[PDB]
Amino acid sequence: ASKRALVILAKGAEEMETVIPVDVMRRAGIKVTVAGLAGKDPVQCSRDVVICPDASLEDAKKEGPYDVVVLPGGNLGAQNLSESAAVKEILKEQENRKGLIAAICAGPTALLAHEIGFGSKVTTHPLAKDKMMNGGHYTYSENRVEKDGLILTSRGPGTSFEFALAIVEALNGKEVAAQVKAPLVLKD
Amino acid sequence: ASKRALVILAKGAEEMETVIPVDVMRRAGIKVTVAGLAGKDPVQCSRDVVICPDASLEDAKKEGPYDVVVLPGGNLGAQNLSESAAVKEILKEQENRKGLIAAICAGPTALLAHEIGFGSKVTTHPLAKDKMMNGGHYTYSENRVEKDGLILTSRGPGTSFEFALAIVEALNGKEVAAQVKAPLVLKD
Strand-pairing partners, residue A139, are A121
Cβ of A184 within 8 Å of Cβ of B20? The answer is no
d(CA A57, CA A63): 10
A47 touches chain B (CB under 8 A): yes
Please give the single-letter amino acid code of residue B96. Answer: N
Resolution, rounded to a tenth of an Å?
1.8
B182 touches chain A (CB under 8 A): no
d(CA A112, CA A79): 11
A62 touches chain B (CB under 8 A): no
CATH number, position A108: 3.40.50.880
Half-sphere exposure of A23 (CA within 13 A, CB side): 30
Structural contact between residues B37 and B9, judged by C-beta atoms closer than 8 angstroms: yes
Please give the single-letter amino acid code of residue B186. Answer: L
B156 touches chain A (CB under 8 A): yes
Start-end of H helices in chain B: 15-27, 57-61, 75-83, 85-96, 109-113, 129-132, 160-172, 174-181
CA distance B12 to chain A (A): 13
Count of Cβ atoms closer than 10 Å to residue A69 Cβ = 23
Number of domains making up chain B:
1
Q: Which residues contact A128 (CB under 8 A, 6 or more apart)?
A: A75, A78, A105, A106, A108, A109
Start-end of H helices in chain A: 15-27, 57-61, 75-83, 85-96, 109-113, 129-132, 160-172, 174-181
Residues on chain B touching A26 (C-beta within 8 angstroms): 47-48
d(CA A115, CA A154): 18
| Omega before residue B21 within 30° of 0, cis | no
d(CA A52, CA B88): 29
Cβ of B157 within 8 Å of Cβ of A185? The answer is yes
Q: Which DSSP helix (H) or strand (E) runs through A139?
A: strand A139-140
d(CA B115, CA B137): 9
- Domain span at residue B1 reads 1-187
Q: Is B47 exposed, middle or buried (0-12, 13-18, 19+ CB in 10 A)?
A: middle
Strand-pairing partners, residue B139, are B121
Structural contact between residues A59 and A6, judged by C-beta atoms closer than 8 angstroms: no
A23 touches chain B (CB under 8 A): yes
Q: Which residues contact A110 (CB under 8 A, 6 or more apart)?
A: A71, A78, A81, A82, A87, A91, A103, A116
d(CA B98, CA A186): 31
Pairing of strands A43-44, A50-52: antiparallel
Q: Which residues of A156-173 are buried (b: 16+ CB within 10 A; e: fewer)?
A: bbbbbbbbbbbbbbbbbe
CA distance B96 to chain A (A): 30
User: Considering only CA atoms, which of A43, A104, A47 is closest in space to residue B24?
Assistant: A47
Residues on chain A touching B47 (C-beta within 8 angstroms): 22-23, 26-27
Sign of CA dihedral B34, B38, B43, B47: negative
Structural contact between residues B3 and B31, judged by C-beta atoms closer than 8 angstroms: yes
First to last CA, chain B: 31
Please give the single-letter amino acid code of residue A40. Answer: K
Structural contact between residues B118 and B151, judged by C-beta atoms closer than 8 angstroms: no
Question: Structure solved using which method?
Answer: X-ray
| Residue B52 backbone dihedrals phi, psi, to 5 degrees | -90, 120
The SS3 of residue B86 is helix
Cβ of A184 within 8 Å of Cβ of B157? The answer is yes
